[PDB]
Amino acid sequence: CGYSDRVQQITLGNSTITTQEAANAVVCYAEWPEYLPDVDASDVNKTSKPDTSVCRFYTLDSKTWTTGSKGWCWKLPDALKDMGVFGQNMFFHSLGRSGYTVHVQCNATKFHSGCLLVVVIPEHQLASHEGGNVSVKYTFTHPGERGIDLSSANEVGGPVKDVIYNMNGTLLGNLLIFPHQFINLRTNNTATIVIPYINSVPIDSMTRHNNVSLMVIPIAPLTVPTGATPSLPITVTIAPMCTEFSGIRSKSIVPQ
Amino acid sequence: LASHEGGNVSVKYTFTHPGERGIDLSSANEVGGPVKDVIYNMNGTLLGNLLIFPHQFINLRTNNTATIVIPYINSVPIDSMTRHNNVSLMVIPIAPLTVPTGATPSLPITVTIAPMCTEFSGIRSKSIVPQ
Amino acid sequence: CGYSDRVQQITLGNSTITTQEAANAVVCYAEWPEYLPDVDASDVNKTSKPDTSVCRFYTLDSKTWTTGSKGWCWKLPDALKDMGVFGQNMFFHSLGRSGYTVHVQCNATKFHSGCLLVVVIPEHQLASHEGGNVSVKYTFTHPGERGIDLSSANEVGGPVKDVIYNMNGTLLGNLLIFPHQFINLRTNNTATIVIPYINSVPIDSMTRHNNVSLMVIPIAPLTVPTGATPSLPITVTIAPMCTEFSGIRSKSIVPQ
Amino acid sequence: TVASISSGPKHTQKVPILTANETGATMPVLPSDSIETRTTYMHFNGSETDVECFLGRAACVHVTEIQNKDATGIDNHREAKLFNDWKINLSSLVQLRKKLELFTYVRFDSEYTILATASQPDSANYSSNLVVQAMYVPPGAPNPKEWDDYTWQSASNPSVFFKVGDTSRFSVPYVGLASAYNCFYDGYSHDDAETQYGITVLNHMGSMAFRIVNEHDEHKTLVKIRVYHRAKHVEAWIPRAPRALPYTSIGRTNYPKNTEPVIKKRKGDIKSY
Amino acid sequence: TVASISSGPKHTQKVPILTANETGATMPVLPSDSIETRTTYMHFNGSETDVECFLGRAACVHVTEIQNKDATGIDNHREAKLFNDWKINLSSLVQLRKKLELFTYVRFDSEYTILATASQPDSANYSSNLVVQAMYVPPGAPNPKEWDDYTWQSASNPSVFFKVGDTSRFSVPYVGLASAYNCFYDGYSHDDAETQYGITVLNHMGSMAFRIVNEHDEHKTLVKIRVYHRAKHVEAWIPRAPRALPYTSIGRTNYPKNTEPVIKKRKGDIKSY
Amino acid sequence: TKDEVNSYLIPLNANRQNEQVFGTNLFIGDGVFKTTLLGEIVQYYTHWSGSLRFSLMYTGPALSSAKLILAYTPPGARGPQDRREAMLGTHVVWDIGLQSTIVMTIPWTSGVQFRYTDPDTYTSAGFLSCWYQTSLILPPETTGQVYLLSFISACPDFKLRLMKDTQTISQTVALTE
Amino acid sequence: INYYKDAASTSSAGQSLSMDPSKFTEPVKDLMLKGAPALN
Amino acid sequence: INYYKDAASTSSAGQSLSMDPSKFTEPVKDLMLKGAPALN
């Protein structure tokens, strides 16, 4: 009985991702993403299913993991609003529903040390740094493909950037309850998380609401060998999956 | 289309691909543009012979609407949509507009088009075209 | 289903070769070497088959791969003319036919970088460096076990030594059409190529003609770690296989 | 088959002669629908009107003159008429162009017939036995540069040799990249503000080079080479409005400025006969 | 036959796109293995790419000039161009040589077609009716020494007679001593320090002698004889790396010193398009 | 400047983020392909159709790691200037590990059934680019640039037609023995 | 009798005997029979 | 119909229809199936 498990590949549309140091992919709540059934539907407009034209992997700009980096946060579907036909359909339709296959990549040598916690939080409602009853402005919660850097300073009307309190008042060690995977450089170069549609409604506005928030947080800090650059590149790859759009209308207007 | 300059002159991309505002045959000719003589169909054929192509008449006495369902017409199965126009829609007044005494000597024409049985292939970064 | 493929061993006569970092052995044109059948035979003298007395592995003098080495070339059966009973039978018989199991070895550490193209060319007819209609002298085309070093300077009446033009007017990137294997130091320490008898005739003169020419050419140059010796040893091991000899006669006389 | 049916008096609430041509349909009204007729037969099949027959007879497509003379003191052998090149297209002759350009797409096998004829406008004592070489240069192959170029060896390119005064004839399968030739193309080579419209590699059959393979003599002989094309196994799609105005260029739909009227004005009013 | 199969999303521990090219095997990875595809058919058989088709069209192999003139006051009739000899080989023309030399061994039946063309560079009043004799001289047979030698009688040697301006065509079976021709030979004629490498009787098809059998006239006519070879029933073994550099001699692999670069250097860096 | 073995080695540099490795147009009868067996055989024909197999083999140290993105851009679109632009098209993310070679097949993307082997813009095949997905990380005590070897072959659905003589070799005078 | 290997070497196919002008004369969605009102 | 006595007088045999590129593309001792690890 001779075989290996570290080698797996995912092909979506015309894009293919290959791996040689992978940990078993995670499927949130053991439920694979699926189309909205007639027994749960509310809006009567027949849904547009674009299949291979939108269901493919999009690479987000790489981030640089330094020894002093606090972590990174992305909001979905906001992070894909400028990505090809998915980005246009998401603004041309009033309502949308979609699952996602998230694939995070961080490769390093056999001498490097460090561990990332890659976790998906549904309704990751952020706290403002000002406390009291202050709200987070739309422009800071919807950054797009450049995401939120938790290493940066706080901003007026912006969310809080203390990673340990998860930007919402919970501790970092408890994030393991949400679908997560670790990129331990000693064991793995890639985390993978398949997310179904998570909402209290069957289909919803894609411009006003983010269903999930992806967080990549270094737990054990980056430890490079003596004489190597104290920095490592992180690339995030996301593919919409089992996507549904409804209520076509003139292009949606958002701030900035 | 034929250029108004004759000889071997080509029609520039910008005059052949106007978008939703189309080509007005009542306007004057332009440098590097197509010819605007409607009687010669902008290509050297006479207007009375256009009836061989799928057509319909909007005779104001009988009708207010023409409708034409077009299949994909090309020598290849699928093709570039930015470099080539498969069909060209022409609306040409044959009998001139005759309004009653004291009415405005003008009538509005609205064109409505729906893509049908549409197929797309080879996704890639957004295509760049002139202007 | 638990097993490994990098470990393979070849025993021919009283010699055994073992490996732990091997790439799957190549069999030229998917045809294993075989004895001449009666339906193809021309000479009526009954053939001498020496079996285990000649069918065994002979190691050729090791070459030193430096960062500036251009490549190496050997001619068969000429390279085995001084090797035991095979070398004597090859000169005592007027005609001979033989297949070969070539095994090239170049071991290195997990920090070394470089790649060798090991390729067998049937009738590798060399070009002289003088151009025009000049012929290559017998003494330069039949060097024996020390082979041809492509890093050396050109010689009067000798072949050309530009490795990129394969010493014959073809480019190096196209040699992959001939039976070949790569010794990528990152993946492998050994190349292996089983060659059948390749000729337009059933049996032929072994002193006047070389059926195949073995070329070992570094494509990616040798990259040693900081502070290691900028040189690596290459050992070539060849075994005659499915060998036939015909027309015994007084010992053959050759130049030098 | 009956052409006209036997038909008597008509007194009905169904009126076949009244219709609405606005629908774009031309009703199949027969002579028997407007007046009373007798039974007669067609006694005709229409074989001469088949698209295979309308496009399937020979017509000249190119005419070119080539000369047997010494190449000494010449920098350009094509300008000296020692060899000549033809960009293959069927749009140089208006009689053939109008028939073929009556359809949008046409797919056919070709049959070329080449006629070479000799002439001595200058002093010559005998009729020279010249042999002409016609070489097909498909797109990508090196077009000959000299009358004695290495290209004429033709190790892979199709080539035909024949005596001047006689003829050669060879068939050619459908060579288009698409499923049918495009007689018209409302498009461009690439998405560019200055690129070529209509004329593009969609209508690029290749080139043909012509030379006299015989060596040069003491007398100059001008040879007029005439290429004739006859189509076989013809298929045509999307019938088009017929060409009315004269042409100005190959592969383009342009017409001359200040052109003469195409409608033959009547002598007298709209009531004259 | 299907070209591309219908294929949807992939989520598997078997990764067909990752391999080890170090093994010398080029994995048969298909378009369906890297992205999601639709079912389409080949609708093509590949008849124009057969080895019989790639080597089975005519190409010129030799060109030679011969003259009808009096043999009085001449010591060498071959140097006077009264008759000419050709050592039979297919390696004189690079267009044909590169195609054929792409394989190590080739076995084929030959078909020779000879084209003779006349020319009068000096004064002549009429086109002379010359008859050319092409004589095959296999190795061992006496090569003609004079234009009127006893050898031309051809009591056993194959010989063909034809009018100048016209052509002759004859088939030849496979004449090699071995089971296939050797395009390359890494060996020598004998075990000698000064003998010939590669060029040897393995590539010796024989010789062809050409003369004008007509008597000599008052006017000089130069006749250019062109030999064309077309292969039939072609078989090929051991495909080889293609020739890149220009050649320098027949039957040898030499190239010129100071040759130009064969790799077309790019304009800009390795990142430009 | 001159033909060298170095011309087959695509250079990789350590500590490069979101940058291009190599780039090329896809005229298989010209440019980098003219001297390859596939491109050289293709030049004996006028028309070509079907899918190409493009492969890369890594040669850096066994303790070295890199993640690269192979991206094919169909015709009609600009040659990509960034990985985000290239990743919008057909692509393979390659994790360099135990399997030393990646094989990305270029699917036949054309309206017309056959393309010309000779460079013609309407029958252009598109573009190929390679970019750093993560970065190249080298083990300690190791220096300089490492190399990738690039390979080309046809898929079993490849088609070629209308034979012609090649312009990759030529002669001015007949050869002699 | 054909004297060559290729279909392109053949003589013409004659005539396509089954003709139907309706696809050009009446390319209308609803079928219209002559005598009945075209419009109602 | 053949008009001569010899096989060398004949026209071409057409095409050898049964092709197999595997002897040139994968001339390896152990057979390798795509998707399974080339090496283990």
UniProtKB/Swiss-Prot annotation, chains A, C:
It is found in: Virion; Host cytoplasm. This is Capsid protein VP2. Forms an icosahedral capsid of pseudo T=3 symmetry with capsid proteins VP2 and VP3. The capsid is 300 Angstroms in diameter, composed of 60 copies of each capsid protein and enclosing the viral positive strand RNA genome. Interacts with capsid protein VP1 and capsid protein VP3 in the mature capsid. The chain holds residues 76 to 331 of 2179 of the full protein.
Swiss-Prot record, chains D, E:
It is found in: Virion; Host cytoplasm. Forms an icosahedral capsid of pseudo T=3 symmetry with capsid proteins VP2 and VP3. The capsid is 300 Angstroms in diameter, composed of 60 copies of each capsid protein and enclosing the viral positive strand RNA genome. Capsid protein VP1 mainly forms the vertices of the capsid. Capsid protein VP1 interacts with host ICAM1 to provide virion attachment to target host cells. This attachment induces virion internalization. Tyrosine kinases are probably involved in the entry process. After binding to its receptor, the capsid undergoes conformational changes. Interacts with capsid protein VP0, and capsid protein VP3 to form heterotrimeric protomers. Five protomers subsequently associate to form pentamers which serve as building blocks for the capsid. Interacts with capsid protein VP2, capsid protein VP3 and capsid protein VP4 following cleavage of capsid protein VP0. Interacts with host ICAM1. This is Capsid protein VP1. It comes from Human rhinovirus 14.
From Swiss-Prot, chain F:
Signal peptide: none annotated. It is found in: Virion; Host cytoplasm. Interacts with capsid protein VP0 and capsid protein VP1 to form heterotrimeric protomers. Five protomers subsequently associate to form pentamers which serve as building blocks for the capsid. Interacts with capsid protein VP4 in the mature capsid. Interacts with protein 2C; this interaction may be important for virion morphogenesis. Forms an icosahedral capsid of pseudo T=3 symmetry with capsid proteins VP2 and VP3. The capsid is 300 Angstroms in diameter, composed of 60 copies of each capsid protein and enclosing the viral positive strand RNA genome. This is Capsid protein VP3. It comes from Human rhinovirus 14. The lineage of its organism: Viruses, Riboviria, Orthornavirae, Pisuviricota, Pisoniviricetes.
